[PDB]
Ligand binder design. Structure first.
Ligand SMILES: CC(C)CC(=O)N[C@H](C(=O)N[C@H](C(=O)N[C@H]([C@@H](O)CC(=O)N[C@@H](C)C(=O)N[C@H]([C@@H](O)CC(=O)O)C(F)(F)F)C(F)(F)F)C(C)C)C(C)C
Ligand SMILES: CC(C)CC(=O)N[C@H](C(=O)N[C@H](C(=O)N[C@H]([C@@H](O)CC(=O)N[C@@H](C)C(=O)N[C@H]([C@@H](O)CC(=O)O)C(F)(F)F)C(F)(F)F)C(C)C)C(C)C
Lengths: 329, 329
C-alpha cells in the first residue's frame, strides 16, 4: 500500500463505523461514514441533551486551530434531523489532515431514539458539494487540491461479522480488496452517488432506475409500489403497525435483486440483505427491504449491497466502480 | 338516542375508521377520525396519483352545493404529506350536516406506504382551530354555533376486535359507554386535546407533562429519554434500528403507566400496550410504544389509552373527560 486507510468496525452486519479526529489535539470521534450526505457534524460540549450525554463531545476551546462562525443550520436526513451551528477546525482522517468547515451540534432529539441506541458520535458526509449545506467542497476533493492524495477518489471495503474488518481508502484503488473486474458506472447527476440501473426481482422490472449508493443506509430501499409487487409473491409476517416484515432466514421463495446495465450485472442474494434477529427466535430475520418514495422512482443500494460489492467513488471520473469483494482479507 | 352516532369499524386490530359523506348527494368516504389534526380532506376525482386507485373519490360536478375556492394547500403529518386545494360543500356526519370548507387532495405521493397499505379515504380533524391550516372552525363548533346539537362536544368509544364495534358520538354524553365517574381535565392550551398530567412509570417520574389525546395515533408516545430509562432493565429487545420492541407476554417485570392529577389517576397496564405477535414467535408480544420528542416533553395517549378509557372532548367547557369504558355493550 501507499494510501490513506481508515479502519472500519462492524455493528452486527447492519452498520459500520469508523473513527476520525477533530482539532490539533486528540479529540477522537466515531462516525457514520456517509456517501449518502455531504456535511460533517460533531456533538458539541455545549450540548445538554440526554443523547450527547453518552457520546464523546467536542471542545472548541481546547484546540489551537479553532475558528468561530456560529451560523445556525438545521441538518435533515430521511431518518431524522439534527441542529446547531457552523464552525471550522482541523479534520484529521487516517493520517491526512486539513482545515475544514463542519457543524457543531447542540440539538439531537430529532434523531432519537436511534442516536442514544447506537455507538456513533456523528456523521461525516462523503457526497458532492451540491448536496452539502453551506457549499462545502468534499474532503477528498480538497485533499487532491492540496496534492495530499494521488486521486480524488475513495474506496469502501466493508467488514463482515465473523470474517474480517474493512477499510475506507482515500487516494487509490487497491487490488487486495476485490476479486474480478471492476465495472465503472457513470453518475447521472453530481449529487448523490447515483447511477442508472435496470432493477428486476423475479418478474417485477423497473428499467433505467435511479440508484443512490449509500454507505449510511442499513437497508435496501425500493420504490414504495415496487415493494408491494414483490410482497405479492412472498409469505412473510407483517409487523402490526410498522412497515417491517419477518421471515425465516432460509425461506427459499426469497428474491434476488438483479441490477443490470450495459457494462455490468450485479445481483444481491437474500443472505446479504436480511437482518438477523437471532435473539428473538432461531433463524429469524427482518426483511430489511424498505418502502421509500423519492421525487424520482429510486433505489438505495445501502450497506447490504456494499457488504458484497467492493466500491470505488471517483470524483475525477464522475463515476462509481463496482466489483466482488474478497471473502477474506 | 338524543345525539348523533357514527359506527367505528376495527381495522385489523390496528386502526379504526368511520364514515362521513360529502356533497349534496351522499358520496361516502372512510375517514380516520382524528383528534390530533384539524382539517378535513377527501381525495378528488381530479386525482392523478397511484395511491388513489383503491379509494372513494369526490366529484364537484355531481353536487349542487359545491362552491369554487381552489387556494393551493399542503397538509403535513408526522406520518407524511398530502396536497391539493380547498373546496366548500355539504359535509354530513352521522346525519348532522353543514356547509364546510375542506381540502380536495390531488397528490398523495408524500403519504406512502401508509395510503396504499390502509383502507381509509380521508382524515377528519377534531382538534382545535389553531391546529388547522387556513383557520377553519371545527365541525363540532359550527354544528353548535348553528344550533344543530345541544353541546359543542364529541365522545369516543373505541371498538375491541373480538367483542364490540365503537361509536363517535356528537353533541351529548351517553351513560351506556362508560362505568363509574367521569373526570375532567382542563386543557393547558387550545391546540391539541392537551392536558397536564404527572407521568409515572417505574421509579421514573416526569412531573407536569403535556399529554395529547390522539384518536388517530395507533400507539402511546413517550419522550425518548424517558422511554430509554424505562426499557433499561426489562427483558425487552429493541431491534437495532427499529422502533420494534419485543418481550414475553408474561414478562412479569413490565411496568404499569400511571398518570395523575388532583382529580384522577389513570393507569394503563401491560395488557393494554402489548400486541400479540404469535406468528413471529410463541408467547411473544410487542410494546405498542413509540419514542417521540416534541419541543416540550410530551406524551401521546393514543388508541391504546382510549381502548381502556371512554373519552369526552368538550369545546364549550375546554376540557377532556375520562372514565373507564364498558367491557361490552
Ligand atoms: C432503514 C430502517 C429500516 C433502519 C434505519 O432507520 N436505518 C437508518 C437509515 O438507514 N436511514 C437512512 C438515512 O437517513 N441515511 C442518512 C444519509 O446517508 C441519507 C440522507 O438522508 N442524506 C440527507 C442529506 C438527505 O438526503 N436529506 C433529505 C434532504 O434534507 C436533502 C434534500 O432533499 O436535498 C431529506 F431529509 F430526506 F429530506 C444518514 F446516514 F443517516 F445520514 C435512510 C433509509 C435513507 C440509519 C440508522 C441511519
Ligand atoms: C409510528 C408507528 C406507531 C406506526 C404508524 O405509522 N402509526 C400511524 C400513526 O399513529 N401516526 C402518528 C400520526 O402521524 N398521527 C396523525 C395525527 O394524529 C397527528 C398529526 O400529525 N397532526 C399534525 C396536524 C401535526 O402535528 N403537524 C406538524 C406540523 O407540520 C404542524 C402543521 O403544519 O400541521 C408535523 F407534521 F408534525 F410536523 C394522523 F393520524 F396521521 F393524522 C404518529 C405516530 C405521530 C398510523 C397507523 C397511521
Amino acid at each position: 500500500s501507499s494510501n490513506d486507510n481508515i479502519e472500519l468496525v462492524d455493528f452486527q452486519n447492519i452498520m459500520f463505523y469508523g473513527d476520525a479526529e477533530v482539532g490539533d489535539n486528540q479529540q477522537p470521534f466515531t462516525f457514520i461514514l456517509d456517501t449518502g450526505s455531504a456535511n460533517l457534524w460533531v456533538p458539541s460540549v455545549k450540548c445538554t441533551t440526554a443523547g450527547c450525554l453518552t457520546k464523546h463531545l467536542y471542545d472548541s476551546s481546547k484546540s489551537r486551530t479553532y475558528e468561530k462562525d456560529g451560523t445556525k443550520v438545521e441538518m435533515n436526513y430521511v431518518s431524522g434531523t439534527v441542529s446547531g451551528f457552523f464552525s471550522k477546525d482541523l479534520v484529521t482522517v487516517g493520517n491526512l489532515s486539513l482545515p475544514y468547515k463542519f457543524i457543531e451540534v447542540i440539538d439531537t432529539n430529532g434523531f432519537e431514539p436511534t442516536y442514544t441506541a447506537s455507538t456513533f458520535d456523528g456523521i461525516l458526509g462523503l457526497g458532492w458539494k451540491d448536496l452539502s449545506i453551506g457549499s462545502v467542497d468534499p474532503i477528498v476533493v480538497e485533499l487532491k487540491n492540496q496534492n495530499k492524495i494521488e486521486n480524488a477518489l475513495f474506496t469502501f471495503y466493508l467488514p463482515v461479522h465473523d470474517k474480517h474488518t474493512g477499510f475506507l481508502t482515500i487516494g487509490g484503488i487497491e487490488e487486495r480488496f476485490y476479486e474480478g473486474p471492476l465495472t465503472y458506472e457513470k453518475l447521472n447527476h453530481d449529487l448523490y452517488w447515483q447511477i442508472t440501473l435496470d432493477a428486476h426481482v423475479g418478474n417485477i422490472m423497473l428499467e433505467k432506475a435511479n440508484c443512490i449508493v449509500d454507505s449510511g443506509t442499513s437497508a435496501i430501499t425500493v420504490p414504495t409500489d415496487f415493494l408491494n409487487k414483490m410482497l405479492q409473491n412472498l409469505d412473510v409476517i407483517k409487523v402490526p403497525f410498522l412497515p417491517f416484515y419477518v421471515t425465516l432466514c432460509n425461506n427459499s421463495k426469497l428474491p434476488t435483486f438483479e441490477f443490470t446495465s450495459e457494462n455490468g450485472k450485479y445481483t444481491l442474494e437474500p443472505e446479504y440483505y436480511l437482518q438477523h434477529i437471532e435473539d428473538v427466535g432461531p433463524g429469524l430475520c427482518m426483511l430489511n427491504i424498505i418502502g421509500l418514495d423519492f421525487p424520482v422512482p429510486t433505489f438505495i443500494l445501502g450497506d447490504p449491497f456494499m457488504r458484497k460489492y467492493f466500491t470505488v467513488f471517483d470524483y475525477d471520473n464522475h463515476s462509481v466502480g463496482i466489483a466482488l469483494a474478497k471473502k477474506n482479507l
